[PDB]
A paper describes a structure:
The β-1,[name] from the thermophilic bacterium [name] IT-08 ([name]; GenPept accession No. ABC75004; EC 3.2.1.37) was found to be stable up to 55°C. The enzyme has a broad substrate specificity, and is active toward various xylans, xylooligosaccharides, as well as the artificial substrates p-nitrophenyl-β-D-xylopyranoside and p-nitrophenyl-α-L-arabinofuranoside in the pH range of 5.0–7.5. The active site of [name] is located at the narrow end of the funnel-shaped central cavity of the five-bladed β-propeller domain. On the other hand, the residues in subsite -1 are fully conserved, including the catalytic base Asp-14, the catalytic acid Glu-177, and Asp-121, which modulates the pKa of the catalytic acid and keeps it in the correct, productive orientation.
X-ray diffraction data sets from [name], [name]•arabinose, [name]•xylose, and [name]•arabinose•xylose crystals were collected to resolutions of 1.70, 2.10, 1.90, and 1.70 Å, respectively. Additional electron density in the [name] structure suggested the presence of five independent glycerol molecules, of which two were in the active site. Of the five glycerol molecules in the [name] structure, the one in subsite -1 exhibited the lowest average B-factor (10.4 Å2). In the [name] structure, 7 amino acid side chains (Ser-4, Ser-22, Asn-49, Met-100, Asp-293, Val-426, and Ser-441) were modeled in two alternate conformations. In total 570, 471, 531, and 516 water molecules were identified and refined in the final models of [name], [name]•arabinose, [name]•xylose, and [name]•arabinose•xylose, respectively. One calcium ion was defined in each final model on the basis of its electron density, coordination geometry (pentagonal bipyramid) and positional similarity to other [name] protein structures. A metal ion is bound to the carbonyl oxygen atoms of Asp-316 and Asp-503, and the Ser-344 Oγ and Asp-503 Oδ1 atoms, with three water molecules complementing the coordination sphere. The calcium ion likely has a stabilizing function. In contrast to all structurally characterized type II [name] β-1,4-xylosidases, protein assembly analysis using the PDBePISA server suggested that [name] from both crystal forms is probably stable in solution as a dimer.
Numbering used by the authors:
A (entry chain A), B (entry chain A): 1 to 304, 311 to 510
Write the structure that this text describes.
């Protein structure tokens, strides 16, 4: 049997995995998007169902001033004695914290803020002697030597016990990070990422008889990397290991699927899966001697996408994210039942601080995305539509707007410091269907007059100008519904009847 | 004593070096630019003076349809018994050839086309038994196994003797290339690049008692790389070795100086220098155990930039390049003595096939570039100015033009599929000074009214949208003087009095 990588497509980076019996749970980083820290469930490591998010309340997730360069970085999920612990960093606040749950269908706890624990990529390990260890990166604010730091932690108090200790510098790659401590067959293993989460990314491992070291570098490090290859999967690393309930070992990690030359990726970092074999002399090797592929053998894992939202429920589906904490009063599923009613503010897609926007990840290179919008702009500033969005300086939109008394459908782009209206056609009714056809190299923007079914191609845009390499930050493209008054509050409400995401 | 890398700043990739006595010569790749294959001279490996170009005649350099993805790829320069051999690939033609010279102040020979020798990165080695070997990459047209291929060559005939043989696959990095064969202390060494000329770039070496192998991989390969580091120098490789006349060994190679995040570079790949030490057991190691720095120790090398062209000579300076083979009739240094007179054609900066353009490399992150232009456009299509140019889809320009009867100074950008006029101001005289201030993140476009000395900032543009990562291809930014009639021949001549390049 085979499976395909990525196992979780689209923007799902920094996967951390946790087994409870014959169930598996996985979390990913979310940066400036709300809610934060998606959590998935699987019984076979290949097929994952999103069960919700870990950070859903303002008290857990403070994203004011957060961007696709900041907000929530790598999360780690662990389970001990019936309690789940999610530990992560809000980089906008420069603070590490934990939330807890004993019931994954309910919400997680208020955060426990870990004072005097800096850096990113915090992780937890529960030892057999009752001690709990927190492990993370160097803290740049304190001018620490680059490497992996660890201390004992008191989980109730949110406090460190004893001293914060450098335990391993890694093999000499940049940005030694993503540390996880495990104990397997009498050895402590410290698994990390080096080289940065770009084309240099790799996984390395060390081991020790003691949890604080000294750690011996694996002699065949790195144990996973596509650096210096032209494989379709790149930037592979940030791994977390699991022993499946049949006894076999596996790693989850992320990688990208870049296109063009030089390589550029727009679907974010995507979660992948590979087997682990343990060498006779006690070291893990991931995949096919440190490499992986799009098609992989499933071992004995038991092997087993069109999304249409009609907005019929008064609860938002788990596909939807907002930019930072949303202004809840500007989105309503009750004002017009069976529609989403949005109130645009002065903020636009060029502003970081929560414009009126709701979006879902692009998870496929080839897909068709559409929405029906009712919008009668009252004044020239007023605008609502459908966006392909990377960050505040990299986004394309097709929208209804008003200029000099006339209603126009427009195609608008922001790329870096360039803001352009690419095309504009007069439009003569109150409802419109917007559709975007994505392929690897371009998005094609069309509108349909609902009353006739006639489609019109308004224009096109390059995927590569929305790529992470171009745009900056740590995220993937979203498709979003938005409204704005372009420096004033938007007096016309925007009503979206439905949203469709149809992958090829 | 110290020196700084890069030793040759700006777009100077794929350096090949050749010693003749106490003189050193070095060549670089030039892609679609004319003339082709710059050649430099040094006596100390650190300071290089450009002495001209190797490919200066249409018979040597056929660049019709060439782009910054094609044209002339890596050159190799060798010397035997008073004759210099320059061997390279015109990738637009998919052909390898050699030109020869016995006098570097004169022009090189007509090409000898090497029939049935495919791939890129051809190199020559003259053995002590009188045999000459050609070495290069796999030929994708023939579905060859990836690796380094070699044969004996008859240099007079331009023909291969005997069989084309795969001699080494490399260590397992992508794109094994840049092969050079040497013979040192009884071993044949095969030095190559792997990983691609981007963030995976590295140098590896193998050795054999025989020129065709079998080759043993160096046990500490790679011997040079910045992969998986955050060093300011990246993408390092494509090395060629020299023994300096004091007996010490050195490598030249290229690397980039990227900025922003993810890393993006706009100055091209730049030539660097590092020492070699030979291990007791007969392997070379480059630099500081396989890494290098911006400041390096000069060993015993004897250690030792404002450019102003007034156009007073009827010979173009060696700074100037054209896009492909120029239409010579459209550039004149004689029509108005002490000025460059250019005739714009229907072709624009968006067209690959030789628009009227002359340019010089950006060689510094911080510099000020200016020109005085006399231009009285006769019709609305007509345009002349100063460009910052990466390729046909990535360039910014400040220019004089005409629209609806009125003369305007404009700032124009092409980025991918976006073509925009960023700003436009009416202008009321026949001469103008254009100036661009570059810094690492942005170019600032100003014009001066020559008659008053008053400067005006017309606008700005991001360096990152001209970077190779964004734009594609294999080159660095140029600053150019251009004219165009935007689909018609430009009826107004453009006269440039001078050009200044003032680095910080
Ligand atoms: Ca509906
Ligand atoms: Ca002059």
């Amino acid at each position: 049997m085979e499976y395909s990588n990525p196992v979780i497509k689209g923007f799902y980076p920094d996967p951390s995995i946790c087994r409870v019996g014959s169930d598996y749970y996985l979390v990913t980083s979310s940066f400036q998007y709300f809610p934060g820290v998606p959590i998935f469930h699987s019984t076979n490591l290949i097929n994952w169902n999103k069960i919700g998010y870990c950070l859903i309340r303002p008290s857990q997730l403070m994203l004011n001033n957060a961007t696709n360069r900041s907000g929530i970085f790598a999360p780690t999920l662990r389970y001990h004695e019936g309690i789940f612990y999610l530990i992560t960093t809000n980089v906008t606040l420069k603070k590490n914290f934990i939330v807890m749950s004993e019931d994954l269908q309910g919400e997680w706890s208020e955060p426990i803020w870990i004072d005097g624990w800096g850096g990113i990529d915090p992780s937890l390990f529960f030892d057999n002697d009752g001690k709990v260890y927190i492990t993370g990166t160097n803290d740049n604010a304190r001018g620490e030597e680059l490497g992996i730091y660890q201390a004992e932690i008191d989980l109730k108090k949110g406090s460190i016990i004893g001293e914060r200790k450098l335990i391993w510098k890694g093999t000499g790659g940049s940005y030694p990070e993503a540390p996880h401590l495990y104990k397997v067959n009498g050895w402590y293993y410290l698994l990390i990422a080096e080289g940065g989460t770009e084309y240099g990314h790799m996984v390395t491992v060390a081991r020790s008889k003691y949890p604080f070291g000294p750690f011996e570098s694996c002699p065949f490090n790195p144990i996973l990397t596509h650096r210096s290859t032209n494989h379709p999967l790149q930037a592979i690393g940030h791994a977390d290991i699991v022993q499946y309930h049949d006894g076999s070992w596996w790693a989850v990690f992320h990688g990208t699927r870049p296109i063009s030359y030089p390589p550029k990726h727009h679907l974010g970092r995507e979660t992948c899966l590979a087997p682990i074999k343990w060498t006779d002399d006690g070291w893990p090797i991931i995949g096919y001697n440190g490499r992986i592929d799009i098609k992989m053998d499933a071992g004995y894992l038991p092997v087993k996408e069109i999304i249409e939202d009609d907005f019929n429920s008064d609860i938002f589906s788990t596909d939807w994210n907002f930019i930072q904490n949303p202004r809840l009063e500007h989105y309503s599923l009750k004002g017009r039942p069976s529609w989403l009613k949005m109130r645009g503010t002065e903020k636009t897609l060029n502003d970081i601080n929560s414009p009126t926007f709701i979006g879902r990840r692009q998870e496929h290179f080839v897909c068709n995305v559409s929405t029906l919008l009712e919008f009668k702009p009252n004044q020239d500033n007023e605008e609502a539509g459908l966006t392909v969005y990377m960050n505040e300086k990299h986004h394309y939109e097709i929208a209804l707007t008003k200029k000099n008394g006339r209603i126009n459908v427009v195609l608008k782009k922001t790329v870096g410091d360039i803001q352009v209206v690419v095309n504009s056609l007069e439009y003569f009714s109150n409802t419109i269907i917007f559709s975007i056809q994505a392929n690897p190299e371009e998005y094609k923007f069309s509108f349909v007059d609902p009353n006739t079914g006639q489609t019109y191609l308004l224009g096109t845009g390059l995927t590569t100008l929305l790529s992470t390499e171009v745009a900056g930050g740590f995220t993937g493209v979203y498709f979003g519904l938005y409204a704005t008054g372009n420096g004033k509050v938007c007096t016309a409400p925007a009503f979206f009847d439905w949203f469709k995401y149809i992958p090829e």
